[PDB]
Design an enzyme around this catalytic site. Sequence first.
Site, mmCIF file in Angstrom:
data_model
loop_
_atom_site.group_PDB
_atom_site.id
_atom_site.type_symbol
_atom_site.label_atom_id
_atom_site.label_comp_id
_atom_site.label_asym_id
_atom_site.label_seq_id
_atom_site.Cartn_x
_atom_site.Cartn_y
_atom_site.Cartn_z
ATOM 1 N N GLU A 35 0.850 -1.214 0.000
ATOM 2 C CA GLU A 35 0.000 0.000 0.000
ATOM 3 C C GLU A 35 0.884 1.262 0.000
ATOM 4 O OE1 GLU A 35 -3.020 0.231 -0.834
ATOM 5 O OE2 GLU A 35 -3.910 -1.695 -0.355
ATOM 6 N N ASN A 46 -7.250 8.544 -6.262
ATOM 7 C CA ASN A 46 -8.019 7.519 -7.023
ATOM 8 C C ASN A 46 -8.692 8.224 -8.199
ATOM 9 O OD1 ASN A 46 -8.940 6.340 -3.766
ATOM 10 N ND2 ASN A 46 -7.329 5.439 -5.067
ATOM 11 N N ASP A 48 -11.755 8.340 -9.048
ATOM 12 C CA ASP A 48 -13.100 8.850 -8.668
ATOM 13 C C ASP A 48 -12.963 10.148 -7.869
ATOM 14 O OD1 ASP A 48 -12.272 7.973 -6.216
ATOM 15 O OD2 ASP A 48 -13.977 6.727 -5.828
ATOM 16 N N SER A 50 -11.498 10.570 -4.966
ATOM 17 C CA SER A 50 -11.140 10.204 -3.574
ATOM 18 C C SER A 50 -9.603 10.098 -3.516
ATOM 19 C CB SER A 50 -11.853 8.941 -3.148
ATOM 20 O OG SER A 50 -11.377 7.842 -3.896
ATOM 21 N N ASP A 52 -6.392 8.018 -1.075
ATOM 22 C CA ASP A 52 -5.930 7.019 -0.077
ATOM 23 C C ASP A 52 -4.790 7.654 0.747
ATOM 24 O OD1 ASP A 52 -7.753 5.355 -1.504
ATOM 25 O OD2 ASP A 52 -6.194 4.011 -2.283
ATOM 26 N N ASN A 59 -9.061 5.224 2.338
ATOM 27 C CA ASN A 59 -9.754 5.983 1.272
ATOM 28 C C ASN A 59 -10.663 7.028 1.913
ATOM 29 O OD1 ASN A 59 -10.832 6.861 -1.172
ATOM 30 N ND2 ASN A 59 -11.247 4.804 -1.944
ATOM 31 N N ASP A 101 -15.823 -4.646 8.459
ATOM 32 C CA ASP A 101 -16.954 -4.147 7.621
ATOM 33 C C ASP A 101 -17.604 -5.286 6.825
ATOM 34 O OD1 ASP A 101 -18.410 -1.725 6.772
ATOM 35 O OD2 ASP A 101 -17.664 -2.220 4.759
#
Length: 129
Positions: A35, A46, A48, A50, A52, A59, A101
């Site tokens: 990562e 990202n 979209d 967003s 990280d 995110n 989650d």
Amino acid sequence: KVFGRCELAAAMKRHGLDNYRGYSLGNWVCAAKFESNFNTQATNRNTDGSTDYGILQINSRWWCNDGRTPGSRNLCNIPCSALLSSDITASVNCAKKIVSDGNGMNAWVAWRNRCKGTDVQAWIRGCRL
Ligand code: NA
């Protein structure tokens, strides 16, 4: 901060990540390697819009507030900048929610593609834990 492999393993264990939701410490060190390359200041945009943040690339889409991700949630109740600290507490706390989650560590696409089913114990090999 750029952690060493055994230094990050030691900090993850001290913050209760080792075997959290059944994921051995090697799985968390492997995810961090791919990562962030163990760099707490790692940020990646990202497509979209967003971002990280941090050692585990959490995110802004769901988990942290960066104030520039339209329609996003802040489910870890933190500024995304707190995920960039040399102290990994906030990153660990928030990664505990992510992995609870329902899809476990599959939430980290790099974990799925590069750690899942591998000899993740190698990541903590020789470490004084
Ligand atoms: Na957000």
